């Protein structure tokens, strides 16, 4: 068979319970990073520069209430959704470079049908197709169920790219972004409990737009002190400035590898 299969984590849009989602995200997090290499207490993702293909991706099996199954391919280096497998058909986003395309040539290799989009799943482009911004795309267990279904039905015919793109944006935020920020995870949990389905408010949006930035600052921050104030956005849109790692402790969960580690302070 394929030289070792990447670890898969299951999640179903059936028993909508807060803890099931918490366990889901928790598993994904621990599945991505080994736990070592933490810049100022915050965990760091493996550097792609020396990360072998056999340690490049993670899979997430999404079961729908109507017994549907889709498997997304997450990139360990930054929880990037590269594609998915709808049964025996696979779809991947247009890679940004050679190495990535070469790396992509490993996911769902046993598929009878394999395809690659002309566009990229990156928010900026994905939103164009969806014809709606993230602030107009609702999140929650409800929208998630719909999303998973849409991905599954792409291969049949009833696809509609706008809907397809929107479906991806949902899965991305609820799975990937939720793992990146404990804060976002909480937002989804709040929704699920009260069976609430709503669009991500300013605070959530900004964090997504600042993941890499924060990762850079947190790593280059001497003794935790941020070299320059990073203006984040509050729930009502009003901007507030962050000055230290301390504030981000309960917020950010995972950081992308930026620079070389310090004198291996993790022990």
- Residues in contact with ligand MOG by the rule CB under 6 A: 79-81, 93, 121-123, 172, 176-177
* CB 170, min distance to ligand MOG, A: 12
Q: Is the CB of 65 or the CB of 80 nearer to ligand MOG?
A: 80
Please give the distance of CA 210 from its chain centroid, rounded to a whole number.
14
9 marked ligand binding residue = yes
175 marked ligand binding residue = no
Q: Is the CB of 79 or the CB of 218 nearer to ligand MOG?
A: 79
15 marked ligand binding residue = yes
Distance between CA atoms of residues 37 and 85, nearest Å = 32
Whether 234 sits among the annotated catalytic residues: the reply is no
Q: Is the CB of 11 or the CB of 123 nearer to ligand MOG?
A: 123
Active-site annotation holder among 6, 123, 152, 153 = 123
Whether 183 sits among the annotated catalytic residues: the reply is no
Distance between CA atoms of residues 151 and 177, nearest Å = 19
Whether 123 sits among the annotated catalytic residues: the reply is yes
Write the CB contacts of 46 (distance below 8 Å, at least 6 apart in sequence): 33, 34, 37, 55, 76, 77, 257
Name the residue number minimizing CB distance to ligand MOG. Answer: 121
197 marked ligand binding residue = yes
Active-site annotation holder among 48, 61, 80, 258 = 80
* CB 137, min distance to ligand MOG, A: 13
Q: For residue 184, how many other CB atoms are within 10 A of its CB? A: 25
Distance between CA atoms of residues 89 and 109, nearest Å = 10
120 marked ligand binding residue = no
* Strands laid side by side in the 57-63 sheet: 8-12, 57-63, 69-75, 80-86, 89-92, 113-116
Q: For residue 214, how many other CB atoms are within 10 A of its CB? A: 23
Radius of gyration for the alpha carbons in the chain, expressed in angstroms and rounded: 18
Distance between CA atoms of residues 218 and 91, nearest Å = 35
Active-site annotation holder among 127, 138, 177, 185 = 177
Active-site annotation holder among 29, 31, 166, 180 = 180
C-alpha closest to that of 258 among 213, 206, 208 = 213
Whether 80 sits among the annotated catalytic residues: the reply is yes
* CB 223, min distance to ligand MOG, A: 29
- Residue pair 75/100 in contact (Cβ under 8 Å)? The answer is no
80 marked ligand binding residue = yes
* CB 124, min distance to ligand MOG, A: 8
Q: Which residues are annotated as a binding site for a carbohydrate?
A: 8-10, 15, 50, 141-146, 195-197
Q: Which residues are catalytic?
A: 80, 123, 177, 180
Residues belonging to the binding site for AMP are 80-81, 121-123
Q: Which residues are annotated as a binding site?
A: 8-10, 15, 50, 80-81, 121-123, 141-146, 195-197
């Amino acid at each position: 068979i394929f030289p070792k299969q990447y670890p898969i984590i299951n999640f179903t849009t059936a028993g909508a319970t807060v803890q099931s989602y918490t366990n889901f995200i928790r598993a994904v997090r621990g599945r991505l990073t080994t736990g070592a290499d933490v810049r100022h207490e915050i965990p760091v993702l493996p550097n792609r520069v020396g990360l072998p293909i056999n340690q490049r991706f993670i899979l997430v099996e999404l079961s729908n209430h109507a017994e549907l199954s889709v498997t997304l391919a997450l990139d360990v280096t930054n929880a990037y959704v590269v594609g998915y497998r709808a049964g025996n058909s696979a779809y991947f986003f247009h890679p940004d470079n050679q190495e990535d395309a070469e790396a992509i040539t490993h996911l769902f290799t046993d598929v009878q049908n394999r395809y690659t989009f002309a566009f990229g799943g990156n928010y900026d482009r994905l939103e164009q197709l969806a014809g709606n911004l993230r602030e107009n795309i609702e999140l929650g267990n409800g929208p998630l169920e719909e999303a998973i279904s849409a991905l599954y039905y792409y291969s049949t015919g009833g696809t509609q790219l706008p809907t397809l793109a929107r479906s991806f944006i949902i899965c991305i935020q609820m799975i990937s972004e939720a793992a990146r920020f404990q804060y976002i995870e909480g937002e989804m949990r709040t929704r699920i409990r009260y069976n609430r389905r709503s669009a991500p408010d300013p605070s959530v949006i900004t964090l997504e737009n600042s993941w890499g930035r924060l990762s850079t600052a947190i790593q280059e921050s001497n003794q935790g002190a941020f070299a320059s104030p990073i203006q984040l956005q509050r729930r009502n849109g009003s901007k507030f400035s962050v000055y230290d790692v301390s504030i981000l402790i309960p917020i950010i969960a995972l950081m992308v590898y930026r620079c070389a580690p310090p004198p291996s302070s993790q022990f």
